[PDB]
Amino acid sequence: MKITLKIWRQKNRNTPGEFKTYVMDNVNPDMSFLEMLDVLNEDLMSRGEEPVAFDHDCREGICGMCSLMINGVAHGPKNAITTCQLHMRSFKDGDTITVEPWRASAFPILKDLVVDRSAFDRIIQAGGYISVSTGSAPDANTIPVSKVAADRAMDAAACIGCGACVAACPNGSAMLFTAAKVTHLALLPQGQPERYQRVVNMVAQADFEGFGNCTNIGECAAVCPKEISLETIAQLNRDLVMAALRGIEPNTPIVPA
Template sequence: MKITRTVSVEVWRQTDAEAHGRFVTYDVQGVSPETTVLELLDLLNEQLPDGDSPVTFDDGCREGSCGKCGVTVDGVPHGPEYNRASCQQHVRAFRDGDRVRLEPLRASAFPVLSDLTVDKKKALRTVVKASRGPAGLKALTNAGCISCGACVAACPNGSAQLFVGSLLTELPPLMKDDDERRDRTAQVIETADETFGPCSTYGDCTEVCPAGLPLENLSAVAREHLRNQRQTK
């Protein structure tokens, strides 16, 4: 028999993008150590007091592979278990199993839309479009990136270096010649610089990445930048 208990959930409530948000605490009953973060939110919504609107959050396949879900658990994007999406994070891993704070993925490039839901697609897609769409999507697929955005939220500077570096690691083999490679990689780097913050080199991004993308991918940005500089001289 699974032991169930009550967990105090401090969750970010924000009605829309223009509203001022705040934390609200709810006691959620029927929680087990195996309960995931998204299941905890399901239970919370089922037990909300009359008159409270459901907590909105990004949901998806709940198998850790689509990249749609994403919340910050006790200050850590996705949660305390390394390299797991929010839907695969379990209550047993919480620092204090009887209390948890849930908030959106925090990054200047990811504006909050409501409660725990953020717009991360616009910023990430801007970079992919700079690589001219299909090639960038294929490069990310080849790299194993699921575009969840946790790497951006984990970086103190809001950098997307792991996302961009993973794209640039796999993009060159898809190009027909050096001129196309130089043109597309330069556009990706310029767009990323305009959209996201600079890389902190702390490596926090690799700890939260559900795909387990390697730290070495960060170097692809500098490598392509230096390569393009040499070719233009």
């Protein structure tokens, strides 16, 4: 299996980058894409060139460190998987594969394929939590939660924060991530006392971070690794409308240090 690759290479944040073509002859069909990139990096190091830098921690599609745009579709041609989960058996011999990182104003490029995703952390910091303290918790079985609500909350909460939704959306918006967090926190009783403020704050933070608006295109849910459906966006819209009816004012934005 001979594979030609076109990897985006950038020296630093301000240095312009360009595509570089690398051809490798022996590629195991059953080995993953990241192992293939590791082999290519080892070959480059043996030759004496600068290795390609990319993000990878878990290699299991849980941590969300992986971030790669392969052949124009995030996380490879296959859906419902992450980049670390993509294997070479899904490609064809002699194919040309294009590799490049996320492209967004809120995701600055630091290396060839490494981007900064602290904007998601700042969005989470803007009320995306439950303001409870340690030691004041009541008994676990105090507040009953219906199984349907718990299942929906768990479905919405399984977001690895990979950022593929931002990079796939033609507007470059973070609506799916914020909607998933808001839906997860608003479907449980513990998040009830401060939901209407929370969403507004989160939404404002997104608008402050440089993310675009939402055109309801639906490209975000098509490449989401954990299949976060579009009902989360509807729930977020309902919550925002209800909060606006109540005269909720957004707080000051979270300024990065």
